[PDB]
Amino acid sequence: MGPGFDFAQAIMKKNTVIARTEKGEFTMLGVYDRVAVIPTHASVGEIIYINDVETRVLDACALRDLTDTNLEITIVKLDRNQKFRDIRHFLPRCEDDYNDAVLSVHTSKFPNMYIPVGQVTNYGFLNLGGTPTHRILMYNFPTRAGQCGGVVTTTGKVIGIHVGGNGAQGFAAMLLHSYFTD
Ligand SMILES: Cc1ccc(CNC(=O)C2CCC2)cn1
Numbered sequence: 001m002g003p004g005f006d007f008a009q010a011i012m013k014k015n016t017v018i019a020r021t022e023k024g025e026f027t028m029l030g031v032y033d034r035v036a037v038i039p040t041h042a043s044v045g046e047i048i049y050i051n052d053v054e055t056r057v058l059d060a061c062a063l064r065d066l067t068d069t070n071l072e073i074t075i076v077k078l079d080r081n082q083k084f085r086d087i088r089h090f091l092p093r094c095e096d097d098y099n100d101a102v103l104s105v106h107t108s109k110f111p112n113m114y115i116p117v118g119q120v121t122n123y124g125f126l127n128l129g130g131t132p133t134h135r136i137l138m139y140n141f142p143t144r145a146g147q148c149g150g151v152v153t154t155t156g157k158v159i160g161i162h163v164g165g166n167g168a169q170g171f172a173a174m175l176l177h178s179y180f181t182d
Contacts, residue, residue, distance in 0.1 A: 030084030
């Protein structure tokens with residue numbers, strides 16, 4: 001409907017796949033080459049389904065900060081025959097607050113879904129499903145089951161992936177440029 005949504009749809013059409021693990025279907029953001037991200041609670045194994053194709057996982061790393069605190073981001077390298085458009089130049093370099101964000105989801109259950117979530121707070125610490133978690137972004141939208149892995153964007157930036165909510169607020173893990181240097 002506006003430049004926020006246009007940015008969102010562009011990231012969603014070229015840089016997302018549907019990932020299926022034993023814990024469900026997730027929106028999965030492709031970042032560059034064969035490297036994508038997913039919430040760590042997806043419990044990625046040796047094999048994952050990508051758009052319903054059986055795919056070997058070449059590497060998976062659950063990120064933690066230098067205090068050894070969960071960040072809820074798993075970086076996955078897929079044995080896929082095709083590279084993602086490199087979007088690393090849309091990743092923020094630092095922890096920050098944002099205005100006017102969109103949360104975008106693409107699954108069997110929620111195809112082509114775009115939610116204007118509004119102001120995003122650098123919340124920091126969250127007890128997420130009983131796990132101490134850092135670098136959490138917060139937005140005042142009642143997000144629901146099925147939205148985990150959804151991409152959080154502003155105009156010009158891919159800032160996070162949706163990892164949970166409490167019925168009134170939603171929570172995203174930050175994406176930082178430093179996670180994807182090579
Ligand atoms: C569906 C669609 C595709 C591309 C575009 C043009 N803008 C971009 O490519 C953005 C830079 C990162 C995403 C707009 N809408």
